[PDB]
Amino acid sequence: CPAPPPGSPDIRAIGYYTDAARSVIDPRLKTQNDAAVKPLNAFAAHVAKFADAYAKGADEAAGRCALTWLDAWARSGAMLGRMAHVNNDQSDYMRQWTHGAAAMAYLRTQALASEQQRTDIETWLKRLSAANLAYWDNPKHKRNNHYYWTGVGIMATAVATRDDTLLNTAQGIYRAGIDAIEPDGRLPMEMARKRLALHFHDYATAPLVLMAEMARLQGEDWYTYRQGALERLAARVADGYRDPSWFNTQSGAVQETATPKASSGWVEFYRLRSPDPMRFDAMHAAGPFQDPRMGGNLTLMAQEGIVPL
Numbered sequence: 377c378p379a380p381p382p383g384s385p386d387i388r389a390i391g392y393y394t395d396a397a398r399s400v401i402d403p404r405l406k407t408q409n410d411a412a413v414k415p416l417n418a419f420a421a422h423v424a425k426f427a428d429a430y431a432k433g434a435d436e437a438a439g440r441c442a443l444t445w446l447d448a449w450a451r452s453g454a455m456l457g458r459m460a461h462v463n464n465d466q467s468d469y470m471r472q473w474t475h476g477a478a479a480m481a482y483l484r485t486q487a488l489a490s491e492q493q494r495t496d497i498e499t500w501l502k503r504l505s506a507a508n509l510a511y512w513d514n515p516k517h518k519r520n521n522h523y524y525w526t527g528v529g530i531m532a533t534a535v536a537t538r539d540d541t542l543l544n545t546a547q548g549i550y551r552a553g554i555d556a557i558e559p560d561g562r563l564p565m566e567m568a569r570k571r572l573a574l575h576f577h578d579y580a581t582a583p584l585v586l587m588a589e590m591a592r593l594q595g596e597d598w599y600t601y602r603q604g605a606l607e608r609l610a611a612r613v614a615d616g617y618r619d620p621s622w623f624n625t626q627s628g629a630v631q632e633t634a635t636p637k638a639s640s641g642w643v644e645f646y647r648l649r650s651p652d653p654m655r656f657d658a659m660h661a662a663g664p665f666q667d668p669r670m671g672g673n674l675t676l677m678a679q680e681g682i683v684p685l
């Protein structure tokens with residue numbers, strides 16, 4: 377259990393796309409952002425590592441280590457200060473993703489928490505939920521996949537604290553994504569991303585599936601809302617990794633060649649829920665899948681449950 381990075385109240389991230397469709401990356405800006413947000417990405421990667429180690433069994437120490445890191449950031453007010461804006465809103469996106477990583481790690485390890493840790497961490501996760509929700513009050517912030525990802529931290533906080541109000545907030549975010557799917561299966565804000573259209577349909581599916589999976593922890597089946605619409609979207613993604621011709625024509629660009637990885641691991645859960653599960657076998661074979669922003673090892677969580685016994 378090494379020492380945590382500092383948890384500053386403040387964030388200063390850098391946007392890295394060159395074009396109107398935010399589909400081509402400037403590698404100099406990407407390197408600059410990577411260095412600027414390194415504490416946030418190292419925090420998320422470590423707490424997910426500790427949670428995965430706890431889930432193997434016979435390692436309560438790894439679970440307690442995650443809680444030590446979360447408590448330290450809670451007591452320093454991490455991410456609750458200034459979101460600095462340089463060339464876009466990357467600082468706010470980073471707060472959305474890192475809140476998700478922290479809240480997932482707490483949900484997986486909270487059985488081991490002390491009294492003081494519970495109060496410290498749950499208070500911090502609720503303040504982050506309120507701050508992230510307030511960003512979307514401005515109607516000029518377009519509610520694409522960043523909005524769905526904001527729902528990850530709100531929903532994990534809701535389940536862990538048993539807050540029916542935050543639970544209703546998250547259900548609204550999930551339903552807004554489901555309602556955006558068109559009859560032909562597209563999400564229009566993601567189809568606008570040219571050679572990354574397929575990439576961002578995959579990336580928008582991931583948080584919607586994860587909130588639905590978290591809802592099973594309170595016995596609810598969110599896949600009955602507009603039943604079948606999420607399957608049309610997921611089927612287009614699986615089809616697209618086989619043959620991208622539909623994404624090519626509807627986006628106006630040839631899709632960037634890529635293998636499924638990281639957050640593509642939503643398929644590990646969803647193949648257990650679909651009426652046509654073997655359609656997702658080709659994507660499954662690219663695994664195992666790990667993503668700290670989704671709680672860690674998705675291949676193992678789909679078999680063993682999100683929260684270890």
Ligand SMILES: [Cl-]
Pocket residue numbers: 388460461
């Ligand atoms: Cl600045």
